[PDB]
Amino acid sequence: MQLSKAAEMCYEITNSYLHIDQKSQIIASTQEAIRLTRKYLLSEIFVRWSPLNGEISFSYNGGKDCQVLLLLYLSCLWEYFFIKAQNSFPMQRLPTVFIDQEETFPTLENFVLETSERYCLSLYESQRVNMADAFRDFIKIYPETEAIVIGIRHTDPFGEALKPIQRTDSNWPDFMRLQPLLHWDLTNIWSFLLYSNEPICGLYGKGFTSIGGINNSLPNPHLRKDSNNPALHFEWEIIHAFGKDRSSAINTSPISVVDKERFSKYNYYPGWYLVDDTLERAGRI
Ligand SMILES: Cc1cc2nc3c(=O)[nH]c(=O)nc-3n(C[C@H](O)[C@H](O)[C@H](O)COP(=O)(O)OP(=O)(O)OC[C@H]3O[C@@H](n4cnc5c(N)ncnc54)[C@H](O)[C@@H]3O)c2cc1C
């Protein structure tokens, strides 16, 4: 859809989530994570750089984390338009960067393309090694790029020293890292993404909890059905998902035939049956 419509839609979704009045530590926690992310964007980021004209590019790889961020970002883009009108919708696409690699799952590539069309992203896609170099090439093509939005957060307990607004290290080309999802935990991610009713990468439906490349990521061994029985913690969000109101259906994207072959050897609960952040990357490495 056109960008103004995507932005207004995401605004309604986020607003609707913020109006959930349920007994729930998860919901209340996620409402707080939403408010902080939106405060970073509206109060610290969009005040300093334009989210429309190319000063900022959004790094998007179709994963759950940058998808949640993209929905929040679009919600803030809607609000930004009115704030700037108040202090003084364009027909265009949102500048976005996707690094495509040889080991990228086709299912994910397809999801990136489809959601680029849904959210009206103007996609730069690299030609299918090291991410630092991929971005160095990007910045050389688009030197006006001042900042890049990154859906990074803490997914193991180890010290990382990340900040919401942070310069790249000297290894990397110079631009500002914008990392407003940093305080989200795994339960917040699933609660919001399932509530949104937006389509999500079909790999999560097959037991992935973290998506890498074909060779470095698998369904989460802790979701293997014959040896684990996790409870569903997001039933309310699923049943009452935005605009849904078949209540129990989850909007997963199609698995590419090649990936279906690759996964035939796999007996796994969907990713949203994992809430233990310590175990999020267990299917990786
Ligand atoms: C734009 C950018 C700038 C970075 N700058 C530094 C730096 O200065 N110093 C440093 O030590 N490390 C830097 N990194 C690496 C980063 O800190 C993480 O160590 C690395 O991304 C792996 O973390 P992760 O596995 O948790 O998340 P990842 O799986 O890498 O995902 C984290 C986020 O990065 C973006 N991303 C990941 N893969 C892609 C892709 N293929 N295409 C487009 N976006 C993608 C998405 O927004 C995603 O939400 C940078 C990474 C990116 C993407």
Which residue has tokens 């610290």?
Answer: 44
**Does ligand 1 lie within 6 Å of residue 180's CB atom?**
no
Of 67, 62, 81, 68, which Cα lies nearest the Cα of 8?
A: 81
- CB neighbour burial string for 232-265, b if at least 16 within 10 angstroms, e if fewer: ebbebbbeebbeeeeeeebebbebbeebeebbee
Nearest 5°: phi and psi at 198? Answer: -70, 155
Residue 57 CB less than 6 A away from ligand 1:
no
Rounded Cα distance, 81 and 246, in Å: 34
What is the C-alpha separation between 121 and 73, in angstroms, rounded?
A: 12
Annotate 202-232 with DSSP letters as a single string: HHHHTT-SS---TTTB-S-GGGBGGG--PPP
Rounded CA separation 207/210 (Å): 9
- DSSP characters for 74-97? HHHHHHHHHHHHHH------EEEE
Q: Is the CB of 67 under 6 A from ligand 1?
A: no
**What is the CA(85)–ligand 1 centre distance, in A?**
34
How far from the centroid of its chain's Cα atoms is residue 277's Cα? Answer: 16
User: 176-178 and 94-98: which strand pairing?
Assistant: unpaired
> Looking at residue 9, what DSSP letter applies?
H
Identify which of 152, 185, 216, 284 to mutate to test ligand 1's pocket (most ligand atoms within 8 A of the CB).
Answer: 152
Strand locations in the chain (E)? 56-59, 94-98, 121-125, 147-149, 165-167, 176-178
Determine which residue's CA is closest to atom 8 belonging to ligand 1: 168
Q: Is 205 annotated as a binding residue?
A: no
Cα-to-centroid distance, 3 and ligand 1 (Å) = 25
99 CB near ligand 1 (under 6 Å): yes
Looking from the CA of residue 148, the nearest atom of ligand 1 is 1
In the chain, where the domains are located = 1-285
Angle, vertex CA 211, rays to CA 247 and CA 277, nearest 5 = 75
| Residue 100, marked binder | no
What are the φ/ψ torsions at residue 50 (nearest 5 degrees)?
-80, 130
**Positive/negative CA dihedral, 75, 78, 82, 84:** positive
- Stated in angstroms to one decimal place, the resolution of this structure is 1.9
Establish whether 61 is an annotated binding residue.
Answer: no
Nearest to 121 by CA among 178, 44, 190, 56: 56
Distance 249 CA to ligand 1 centre (A): 31
Which tokens belong to 95? Answer: 């500048």
Does ligand 1 have an atom closer than 6 angstroms to the CB of 123?
no
Assigned CATH for 1-285: 3.40.50.620
| Token couple for 259 | 């990936």
For the chain, what is the total number of helices (H) and then of strands (E)?
9, 6
> Taking the alpha carbons of 154, 160, 161, 165 in that order, is the dihedral positive or negative?
negative
Cα gap 171→137, rounded to integer Å: 14
Give me the residues paired with residue 147 across strands. 56, 176
In Å, the largest CA–CA distance within the chain is: 61
Residues 6+ apart with CB under 8 A from 87: none
**Which residue, by CA, sits nearest to atom 21 of ligand 1?**
152
> What residues contact residue 7 under an 8 Å CB cut-off, 6+ apart?
74, 75, 77, 78, 81, 89
Task: Find the 140 Cα to ligand 1 centroid distance in Å.
Answer: 18
Q: Is the CB of 145 under 6 A from ligand 1?
A: no
Three-class DSSP category at 190: helix
Distance in angstroms (rounded) separating the CA atoms of residues 88 and 162: 34
Can you list the pairs that 128-132 forms with residues at least 24 positions away whose Cβ atoms lie under 8 Å? 128/100, 128/101, 128/102, 128/104, 129/101, 131/99, 132/171, 132/172, 132/173
Alpha carbon distance 222, 275 (integer Å): 11
Instruction: List phi, psi (to 5°) of 250.
Output: -120, 130
Q: How far apart are the first and last CA of the chain?
A: 37
Task: Please count the residues of the chain.
Answer: 285
Measured by CA distance, the residue closest to atom 26 of ligand 1 is: 152
- CA proximity to 114, closest of 200, 44, 14: 200
